[PDB]
Design a protein around this ligand. Sequence first.
Ligand code: HEC
Ligand code: HEC
Lengths: 127, 127
Amino acid sequence: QFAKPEDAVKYRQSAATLMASHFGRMTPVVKGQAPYDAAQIKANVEVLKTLSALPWAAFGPGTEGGDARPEIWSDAASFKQKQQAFQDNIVKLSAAADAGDLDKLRAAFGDVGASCKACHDAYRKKK
Amino acid sequence: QFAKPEDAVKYRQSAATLMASHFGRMTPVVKGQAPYDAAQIKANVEVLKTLSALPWAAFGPGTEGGDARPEIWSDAASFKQKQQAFQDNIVKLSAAADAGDLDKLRAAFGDVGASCKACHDAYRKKK
Ligand code: HEC
Ligand code: HEC
């Protein structure tokens, strides 16, 4: 869907921006600094689930740019493993949210964050 | 969910970027220049539906910035009417996609595009 590689870069960066907001806005809730409303979090995690499927199709070969490290394309299987494992972690977060289980939510939230970081550490250029 | 107004601006611009990609990527399909696969379009419109609900909460009072025109906040009811009417147009597009009806899809797609433009004309600053 991208006329030029720059369009893929802009897309995946915007998807990431939205993921960071929908993930990060739950930090106060999982810390107990903001109240836990199960329906609110269920709905937010459903947005995050949709968003968290979106970046990967925007790393389609030849879309080097931005802060993607080159290793994404040359090790396609390993990058796919990491995005699939991340989306798996999002499924666990969805299950916790859908159950209204705050303890499971906290644990799942931590695992998701670790998965974001693990991918960035391997595949995102430093600043 | 925004620490500063700049964060709301970045969010709503990124949401718009994704909406433009998910809407605009169907142009060749509605023109017949690309093939029509009903399942593909159904899934894409479901992404667009999720995305098209997201910008509005990121124009929460005092978030002047970016290319929002000031009129968004001082005429809250009129801006709300336009976003709700736009989301209505997205419901029509969803119905067409879910029905697998290409003629209804074309018509709905045009109405959605007109709704995007009508809001920009009133509420987005020129370049
Ligand atoms: C690999 C499987 C990733 C996972 C899992 C997550 N992210 Fe990511 N992210 C990844 C890459 C390769 C890039 C660089 C994209 C580019 O072309 O520049 C990013 C980028 C981000 C950013 C920065 C976006 C920008 O402003 O330019 C953010 C804020 C970000 N990613 C957030 C994020 C979160 C919150 C994640 C888990 C919920 C997450 N990413 C997972 C690769 C991967
Ligand atoms: C009002 C109810 C709007 C509707 C409906 C749509 N858009 Fe919009 N859009 C709106 C505003 C006020 C702004 C400016 C945001 C800011 O703070 O700068 C925008 C912006 C865009 C952009 C530019 C994003 C950027 O790169 O900075 C795009 C590409 C965009 N909008 C696309 C878009 C599409 C495709 C829409 C219908 C499917 C649509 N917008 C509707 C307000 C409104």
